[PDB]
Amino acid sequence: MGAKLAKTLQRFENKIKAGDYYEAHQTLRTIANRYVRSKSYEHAIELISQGALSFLKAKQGGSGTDLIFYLLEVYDLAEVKVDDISVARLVRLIAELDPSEPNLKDVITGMNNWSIKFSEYKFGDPYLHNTIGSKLLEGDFVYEAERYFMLGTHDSMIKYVDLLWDWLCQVDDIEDSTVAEFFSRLVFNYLFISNISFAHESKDIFLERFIEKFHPKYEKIDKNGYEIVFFEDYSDLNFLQLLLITCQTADASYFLNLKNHYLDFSQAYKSELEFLGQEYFNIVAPKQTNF
Amino acid sequence: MGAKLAKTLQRFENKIKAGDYYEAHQTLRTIANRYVRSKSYEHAIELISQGALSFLKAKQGGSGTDLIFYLLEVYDLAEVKVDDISVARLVRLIAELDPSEPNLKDVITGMNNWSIKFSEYKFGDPYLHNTIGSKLLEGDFVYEAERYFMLGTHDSMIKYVDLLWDWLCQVDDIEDSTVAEFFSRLVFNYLFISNISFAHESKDIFLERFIEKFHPKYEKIDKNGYEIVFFEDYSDLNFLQLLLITCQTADASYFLNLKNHYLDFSQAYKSELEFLGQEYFNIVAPKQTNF
Amino acid sequence: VEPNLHSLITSTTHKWIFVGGKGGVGKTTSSCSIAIQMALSQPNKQFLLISTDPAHNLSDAFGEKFGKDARKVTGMNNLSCMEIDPSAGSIPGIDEALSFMEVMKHIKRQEQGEGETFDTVIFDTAPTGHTLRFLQLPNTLSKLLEKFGEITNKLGPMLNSFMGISGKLNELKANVETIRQQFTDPDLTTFVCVCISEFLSLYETERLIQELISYDMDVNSIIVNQLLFAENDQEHNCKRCQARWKMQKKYLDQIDELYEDFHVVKMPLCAGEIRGLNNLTKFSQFLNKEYNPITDGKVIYELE
Amino acid sequence: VEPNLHSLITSTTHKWIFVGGKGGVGKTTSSCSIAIQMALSQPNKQFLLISTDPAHNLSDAFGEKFGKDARKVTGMNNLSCMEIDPSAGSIPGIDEALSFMEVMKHIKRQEQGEGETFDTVIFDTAPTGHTLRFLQLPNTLSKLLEKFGEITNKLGPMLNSFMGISGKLNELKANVETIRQQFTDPDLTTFVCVCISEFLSLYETERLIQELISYDMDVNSIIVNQLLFAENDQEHNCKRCQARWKMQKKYLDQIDELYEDFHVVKMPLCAGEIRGLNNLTKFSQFLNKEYNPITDGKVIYELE
Amino acid sequence: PTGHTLRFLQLPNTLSKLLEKFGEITNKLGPMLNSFMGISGKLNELKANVETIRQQFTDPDLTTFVCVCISEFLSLYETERLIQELISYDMDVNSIIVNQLLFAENDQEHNCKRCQARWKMQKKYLDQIDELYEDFHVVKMPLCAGEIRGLNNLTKFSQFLNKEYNPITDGKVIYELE
Ligand SMILES: [Zn+2]
Predict the structure, then answer these.
(1) What is annotated as the active site (chains C, D)?
(2) Does D185 touch chain A (CB under 8 A)?
């Protein structure tokens, strides 16, 4: 079995380098179905995955995409649990995917859904998300990449700061409130999943780039270990930085005082603040619109 | 549990060496019943067995006998399978039994029955029988000992030849047909269970003692590896020796010729020969009475 | 058998002390008592009394607040108390395992954050729920592995070795180790049961002990509080009290005949409930030396 | 894929050759054929052809008496035949185990009493009864041990080690070894199936192969005898024969599309049945080199 | 062609009989006391019983099962089991059709070993069928060159189901459908 699989795999990638795509795809699936029929999942998984790899490497999205789905089907049929090996196979296949593949999103969804059903993550495996995010970004699917990166690993956090930084730079007419529209996303998103570490690191990397490119007037304020890059021309950024630390204290008073001083910002981020006040200050009372 | 059992066992054998038999017996059983109630058989088995040993060593057949039965009950309740350990416990207890114990036979039967239910032997474990046989013989229960020895081990075979030899010697008025009444038992019994090895060894040991005590006229006849101690004054013994070898050939002709030459003997051992002719010659036709 | 817990109170090897008794039979009391007697008798060893009763019986028995964080009872630098909540159907043993595994994490956590180490822990078992159910699964499932391992040895191992006794050995190794966690040595672990001379109590006691015996868990101590001994108290009279003890004496005899080789320590009845470190130590003294209603009558009418 | 058994007939590593085919599809024939082809191609290795068919097909195929005692077929000092009776519901695998374990005892017994050793055995599987059912129990029950071993690891192994990964290691060892007895290397063991181009046969074949695949047993050889190829034989005519092959050609195409990467060797139909060492070797030559009804027509109308 | 579409031909009798074990047993000592606190049950059961058994038995004079096969190992195996299955359904079965038979020892235009050998094998099994199903209607149908299609060729071939096929005289009708 082990010596037979290896062999045929060459006569398959031989039909692929020869042009015989139909032959290569038809033969492999029927044979793969046989393994599945006998519950020899493991065998089918390697065969299917390998077949999908070669197809994608040969720029044959059609077959490649199809096999990925078939693989996933088995994954759910074999109740393959989410772990390094299981994820690795998908990551290796995602890397060979063409950012323009008409099925991209579907493929991504399928993989992630699998990770959700066979893991304790309500939204999928972190590591897996790191790969998925990059793929989505290659097809200009920014918004989709942002979400995955938000729920990704440390590398995702870096690729999320780059996604937001390369977007801010793309803006021809920058303004005081423009830098906040991007920066705020980092503070709010990470604060929702309560990942203070990523919130602070993403903040530092983004605020430092902003200082080395736009050269805005500022001065770092340090107090009891904490620092707040006070921008002289960006109040939005000052407020946002204070909001982060405030949530860390989980003290109602501080949250109320910060909002009362920045009435305008308190109405721009109405819904957002309402949530933060419930997750960090146990507030059940809705957010009263200032304006 | 292991440290508690050991302890109490001394305070028990302390009540036995003190005379407090009732106390020792009552306490142990109730406690043992507790282990059994919780299905902690193993514990009860060691406790009960140990208690029975001490009672028998103190010449207290009453309690000793009772405990043996109780042990057996558990043995069947715990479905204890027949093996060295299982048999050993019973052998060790059988050794301390008084040959005159009013329950002897019952105790023996119980133990053997257990061996039959939890083994592949239709009549009980061989080794076990070896011990049982000796015990029965100590109470002058010869006939019962003979059966067990017959279905015993190699040592049993020796103790069976001694049981038959000491019986033959007990006869005040020995005759030509007297020596056959004892010797024949060895040949027939072992030939029924088809144990040619024991049949030949038992024969050799019995025929040699007979020659060194009675000094009968004989001459060893050797042919093709086989030997037949031809007695000049014991035709019965000659016939019996030929019968043994005959069965070994499993040839109908030889069996018929041997019987036709010894018509008298063919009627004395009518039933016996009928059986042998069915087990060694595939004869379905009954034995026609010569006289 | 000495009707006391001396041998246990003075034992420096024991490191696992169980204390059960369903029926509001004064479990909490006996627990604090046994813990104090051992701590005072062995000042060279740290003891830890932990309970799971949601009523916070240990905090109401001593007179101080006890939480998930082990704290030395005021006045003693040898005894410590712990009150944790053991909670804050397909496979047997699992649930119980999770419950006990969690309580032990609360133990090692309090031995790192000051306290360092407790030589013997006094487990104040919960009022309800057989928290010792998992004390049988480990031996159960394991023995099944043995039936599995052996049988999986088709004729051979002649041919089984040609296509492929490490299995018969590692099994026996995983076997003993497992059986060593339940047996946990009778010299290292024991179980103390508590009850009173009353029908229902005996019923509850009898079964409790059976359950423990099936766990192979050593059990030889039965505490019986609330006893009257109203035939010796210096200030007789009161039929009401004499009649009640006539009934308690009835069952007490069933206990002395049911558990002949058990440590049946008969504790005296106190006017009111015993609370506070002081009244507890003076009452626990009877667990070391038998209580004599003829002479110790004072100590009782003292706690009143 | 060469429509022949060359690679196998010339293989000196294989030591386990399976041969099945329910339906009186000429199983016996193919068995003796594959055995002779390998014995003649590798005279430097001892081969053993054993059957369990109560009809004594091997004795009727060669023309000599073969019993439980391995005997060299007359005329060959490389091939040997064995005809044993594999017999003379609660737990799956057991029964099958006992059956196979017994046949292997008959093998090692004939290698000690002259014959010394057979490098590759040609198993002529029984006509009925899945004698390879136990080819899945060992992997089955074992995997259950893994679910057993792991789960039995309550929170920890922090506390599980305080009351007591030798279990996770020995399991994996007993795991591989086992899987090594079923997998038995595809380069060491293989299975050859036999059938004919007929509905019922295909049905029986399709399932047989599925069964083996569930055993992870390598299968890539399908023998199809009784083929007519009545469109090439030099002496055409006979509609009866042409019509029959038109039907056989129908299914044969289903076989070449069902088993695309399988060794589908199409054997020719012979007038009468092939018996005797001579007529067998000349017919088995087609198992090494494809049969051409255009040129090899003589060899067939020769066995007639 | 596949799937035992007659599997439900046993459930109705099955579950019903279970009702009887249920109904009776539910009759604790009595009906002395069972009637003081409350045989309509023992009667209605027997009524729902017969009616049910009447849907399976469906009268052998009203319902029957005709099986089809050929003289070949695998076929016999399939046939033997099929009949067992039906008998467990109490469904009447006494007709076994065996087509594709050669009878190559009578056809006027002998020769062809290939055809003679095949029938020698079909004759082997056919004897197992005549000894296995002694009291069954084993109608042996002749083999036709090509497949029979069209109302015409069908009626002329089905005539042998009414009157036995004689390879000595009816040889024409066969080499006719060709
Ligand atoms: Zn023809």
Answers:
(1) 53
(2) yes
| Helix boundaries (H) for C152-287 | 166-182, 199-214, 239-258, 277-284
Tell me, yes or no, if C85 is annotated catalytic: no
**C224 is annotated as contributing to ligand binding:** no
CB contact under 8 A, D200 and E111: no
Q: Could D187 and A38 be called an inter-chain contact, meaning their C-beta atoms sit closer than 8 Å?
A: no
Residue pair D301/D284 in contact (Cβ under 8 Å)? The answer is: no
Contact residues for C128 (Cβ-Cβ < 8 A; gap 6+): C22
Angstrom distance (rounded) from CA A47 to CA A52: 9
Q: Which residues of B touch C (CB under 8 A)?
A: 1-4, 8, 11, 27, 30-31, 34-35, 37-40, 43
Shortest CA gap D257–chain A (Å): 9
CA C75, C80, C86, C90 torsion-angle sign: negative
CA distances C272 to A281, C169, C226, C291, Å, are 47, 59, 10, 18
User: What's the CA gap between A60 and A19, in Å, rounded?
Assistant: 11
- Please report, for chain C, the start and end positions of each structural domain, with discontinuous segments joined by +: 1-304
D181 touches chain A (CB under 8 A): no
Least CB–CB distance from B4: residue in C214, C220, C260: C220
Burial class (CB in 10 A: 0-12, 13-18, 19+), B285: exposed
Question: Is D173 labelled a binding residue?
Answer: no
Type and span of the H or E element at C223: strand C219-227
* C-beta separation of C46 from C14 below 8 A: no
Whether E34 and E60 have beta carbons less than 8 Å apart is answered as: no
Q: Do chains A and E touch (3 or more CB pairs under 8 A)?
A: no
Kindly give the interhelix angle for A178-192 and A154-170, rounded to the nearest 10 degrees. 160
Contact (CB<8Å) C94/D141: no
Side-chain-facing half-sphere of B37: CA atoms under 13 Å: 14
**Best to test chain A binding among D216, D256, D263 (most A CBs inside 10 Å):** D216
Note the resolution in Å, 1 decimal: 6.0
Taking CB atoms and an 8 Å limit, are C101 and D152 in contact across chains?
Answer: no
**Which chain B residues have a beta carbon less than 8 Å from that of C216?**
1, 40, 43
- Residue C269 is given by DSSP the state P
Spell out the residues 6+ positions from residue E76 whose beta carbon is closer than 8 angstroms to its own.
E69, E125, E128, E129, E132
> How far, in Å, is the centroid of ligand 1 from the Cα of E114?
5
List the CATH code of the domain at C1-304.
3.40.50.300
Distance CA E93, CA E66 (A): 6
| Structure determined by | X-ray
According to DSSP, the residues that pair with D223 across neighbouring strands are D194, D265
Q: Report CA(E117)–ligand 1 centroid distance (Å).
A: 9
Is E72 labelled a binding residue? yes
- In this structure, the strands spanning D79-83 and D47-51 are parallel
What are the tokens at E13?
A: 């009798």
Cβ atoms A64, A49 nearer than 8 A:
no
**Contact of C19 with C27, CB cutoff 8 Å:** yes
CA B243 to chain CA mean position, Å:
24
| Chain-chain contact of C108 with D154 (C-beta, under 8 angstroms) | no
One-letter-per-residue 3-state SS of B128-193: HHHHHHHHHHHCCCHHHHHHHHHCCCHHHHHHHHHHHHHHHHHCCCCCCCHHHHHHHHHHHHHHHC
Cα–Cα distance, B179 to B229 (Å, whole number): 14
Length of chain A in terms of residues written: 291
Strand partners, D47: D79, D120
C238 touches chain D (CB under 8 A): no
Contact between D42 and D80 (Cβ < 8 Å): no
Instruction: Return d(Cα C227, Cα B61) in angstroms, integer.
Output: 43
CB atoms within 10 A of CB D194: 29
